[PDB]
Amino acid sequence: VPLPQLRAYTVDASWLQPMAPLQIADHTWQIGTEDLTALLVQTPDGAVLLDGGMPQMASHLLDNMKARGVTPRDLRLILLSHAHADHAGPVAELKRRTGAKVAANAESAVLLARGGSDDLHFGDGITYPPANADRIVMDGEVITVGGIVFTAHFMAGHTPGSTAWTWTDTRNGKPVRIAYADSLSAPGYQLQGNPRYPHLIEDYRRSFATVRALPCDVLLTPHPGASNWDYAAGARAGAKALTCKAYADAAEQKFDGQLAKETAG
Amino acid sequence: VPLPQLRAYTVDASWLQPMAPLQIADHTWQIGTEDLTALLVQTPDGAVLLDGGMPQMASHLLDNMKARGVTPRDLRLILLSHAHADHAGPVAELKRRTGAKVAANAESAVLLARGGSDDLHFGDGITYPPANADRIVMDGEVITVGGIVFTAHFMAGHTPGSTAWTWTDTRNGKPVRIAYADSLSAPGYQLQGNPRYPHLIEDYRRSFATVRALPCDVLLTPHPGASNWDYAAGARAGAKALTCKAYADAAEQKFDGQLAKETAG
Amino acid sequence: VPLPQLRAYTVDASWLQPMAPLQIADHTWQIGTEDLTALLVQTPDGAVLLDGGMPQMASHLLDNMKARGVTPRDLRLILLSHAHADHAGPVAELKRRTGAKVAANAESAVLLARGGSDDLHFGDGITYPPANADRIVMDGEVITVGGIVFTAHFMAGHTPGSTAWTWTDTRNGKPVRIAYADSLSAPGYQLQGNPRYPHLIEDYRRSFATVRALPCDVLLTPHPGASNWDYAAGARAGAKALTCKAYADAAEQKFDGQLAKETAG
Amino acid sequence: VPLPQLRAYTVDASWLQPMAPLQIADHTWQIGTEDLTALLVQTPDGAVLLDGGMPQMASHLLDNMKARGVTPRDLRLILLSHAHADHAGPVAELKRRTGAKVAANAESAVLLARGGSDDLHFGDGITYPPANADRIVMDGEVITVGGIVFTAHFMAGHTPGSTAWTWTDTRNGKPVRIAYADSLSAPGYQLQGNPRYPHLIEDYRRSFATVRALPCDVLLTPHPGASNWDYAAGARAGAKALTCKAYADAAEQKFDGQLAKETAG
């Protein structure tokens, strides 16, 4: 009996289904796939990308940037929700192919630098090309690109480095406070007494509170379904979106159920 | 007028004054200098070093290890209080010259990897040879070496990655809970509204509480004077040592005074 | 049409077929799989591993080390032929699970550090968990472990960092000069006018000459078939092994044929 | 007796004496100090910097870029002769303060990444803030920025990663082939039988031949005096410059004298 072959990280087709750019606000576009968020924020002083999705999405992202008028040199900054393969997958390649630099917190930078390997919960099962961060950010730190101010809100749990990013855009003449909140799920995680993450539960509870309180006229999430976005629904893509409060409440209720199931399991 | 010459990080002579090993408990020795802590914990399955002091201390540390019966191959693990040049200085060289691997939290690992450069408060003024961590630890995680169990207690503030390490040794037949608590000082730091560390004050306040509650029959600190140790006093070196509670209270009182002076300054 | 799913690096079953340790000389054992070399050199001062094979081989390697009397702490050093996924695959995990440190040349270290991503010829198609080198070696540099002297002979081509490692063991009372020579193949490579490797052809020609001249009573290669080893043949596993001269001549003849086919293709 | 204080890397004042930009050809300017080269190549698609000098030169470089019409976002690329502190010193800071990415060969990248520490000859005596390379280049590889084509010519010796960079500019309507050739000195180096660099002599001899044959209407060197440039001499700064052939011959004659002195010493 030979050792097993390596298994690739395969995903639902919709996660890999390209879509054309979908405008969220005056400067903010969804440019990823139907079921993975990748946000382009376009400014008079260059563009910012928040997440890139799966590794094989680099060229599609670049096509959509081009459709928007953003050349590779115009992409200045990549920000991440968290450094798993389905959100940070193409970062290394985008850095090679654009002017983009990565800003991330220390936890995300170290996970990004090992390509998602030695994950606290997934081990080496879900990896991707490693990349280096160019700037380390602290909780509450701001980065400004052509006058869009992005604020980091750490919300550790799904990964130690999970981050919400907030900024204010405009729409129909009025401010829109956009909150790109990270995942609050714990898929197959050992929650209680995890030797690799001993304060996991406390971190999730603090993160629910952080998400609940974000400035949040519009919530977006790395998996759009988690905030009830439907990117394929066109003019009504965001009509059913949750508030940050509702998103945090739903995640906490699910988390509490998982804790009870783990105790019983 | 030429640009200024580079300025070396110079320190009081006592910080660089070698001392012979000073026993703290059955397996735990101070092996650094008179005024910089470097703790050797010797076990039947190899040795652990907590901090190394200044960069030029590597050979002295190695001499004292040898005096204790620890060869380079026997040194298994280096742990750090925080990754400033006067505590992590010789880490890179010790890794080259021993079997030692470094375990640190993500913040300390990223600061260690850039040799203390781009410090949030010191800039590039206090740097040292960079080194890589071999293991990333999470808050409350344990590492066990020949049955001495070391527990990490994050106490962010002096650096984002500041850590207290605790373990239980023996003395005169009874357990001794040793707490190696990191610095709680903020030397020349901008405390309020620091764009590079926006939650600095909240982190220090949480860290005072963490230090106050540590398991702590014996407190040691990276600068021995901060816990009222006198390594040159022989049999009474630790006689005047503070409790963890007293250390935390003194640091908080000093911090509060610094906050008031900063507001007035 | 969705973007394609990620494809895993799959290999012939024999590459993944565990075997028991096979003695090559008094201190040198093959401990990998039937069709991937991983050499254990056991000394009174610890053990050296040369290559590890595929990523999923870590636990098997560790089992065979244990069978040989080598515990994780006894493994001191990992050396590499080249940093592709089927030879360096388990390095990261072995470093986490043993005392082992990696020594490699700069080219191999940088490819190892990006987990084989952005390969000059394979792109991101054949990746693995990234790892850091602990020591950078120069051409002709020696490393000594318990008195086995390992010499590095750079033989760039298959990868920029391809290395032959040589050492002298004993057998039946007499010296045996062992040469672990790297691959000299160029599978699907663009040889002529490659913008990512402009001196590729010159490097291969110099490497054929290097391999031809190695001290070489016994030749071993990362893919055993390349040197006509049959690890499953027991007492006659090495009976048909090529000389280094014959190996270099065969590789050059194949290379010349590939050059002619590329010109015609 | 305390251990000695750290010693800063101090240099002749002229190495730190700022100068205004000095035009070499239509797109190429010296923007460093009187006695350290830092070349700015300005193109319609952004700017390239070759070397930066000492660590404390970052702001001066940025001032001279601004004087030339180059903002921080316009600096696209940093190339290096070699990664010693007096040529790569400010790279880390320039990357933080500009859009610039670093391209270097593997040897230079690994030395840059450890801030010049563990130098083959200098040890930790001459260090600087570490930086990461964004692109690894191979010998003879080209990089093109707004149609200036830069070619790498490895010339190992002074450091393993020493590189000459060549490109074609214009002047008075005609092409000017500029060669920025690295140092060929070996200051205090052990040349013969160096265990850290066993093929040192062979590499220097090959590098003399490489430099002799470069395309070279105008030779520039990291230390201008080595090619008989006088940056403070204005309109005649380059009048006495050596050819590449003369530079290589002089370096080889000096090297041969050093070899003879080492044998006698």
Ligand SMILES: CCOC(=O)[C@]1(CS)N[C@@H](C(=O)O)C(C)(C)S1
């Ligand atoms: C079990 C493997 O899990 C994953 O690869 C992800 C990565 S975010 N996490 C899951 C989750 O968060 O429930 C998901 C299905 C949304 S994708």
Ligand SMILES: CCOC(=O)[C@]1(CS)N[C@@H](C(=O)O)C(C)(C)S1
């Ligand atoms: C002002 C520079 O500061 C330092 O280099 C250190 C490093 S810990 N911090 C100081 C402090 O903590 O007060 C110190 C004097 C104990 S040394």
Ligand SMILES: CCOC(=O)[C@]1(CS)N[C@@H](C(=O)O)C(C)(C)S1
């Ligand atoms: C085409 C992909 O190639 C590979 O993944 C390897 C890695 S060494 N190279 C091949 C070769 O060297 O011919 C091989 C079949 C021996 S495996």
Ligand SMILES: CCOC(=O)[C@]1(CS)N[C@@H](C(=O)O)C(C)(C)S1
């Ligand atoms: C002895 C220390 O040396 C150096 O720091 C440099 C760095 S290039 N090398 C010298 C040389 O090349 O002769 C120099 C004086 C030009 S500066």
Ligand SMILES: [Zn+2]
């Ligand atoms: Zn995730």
Ligand SMILES: [Zn+2]
């Ligand atoms: Zn996901």
Ligand SMILES: [Zn+2]
């Ligand atoms: Zn400090």
Ligand SMILES: [Zn+2]
């Ligand atoms: Zn200190």
Ligand SMILES: [Zn+2]
């Ligand atoms: Zn290969």
Ligand SMILES: [Zn+2]
């Ligand atoms: Zn192979």
Ligand SMILES: [Zn+2]
């Ligand atoms: Zn130099």
Ligand SMILES: [Zn+2]
């Ligand atoms: Zn120099």
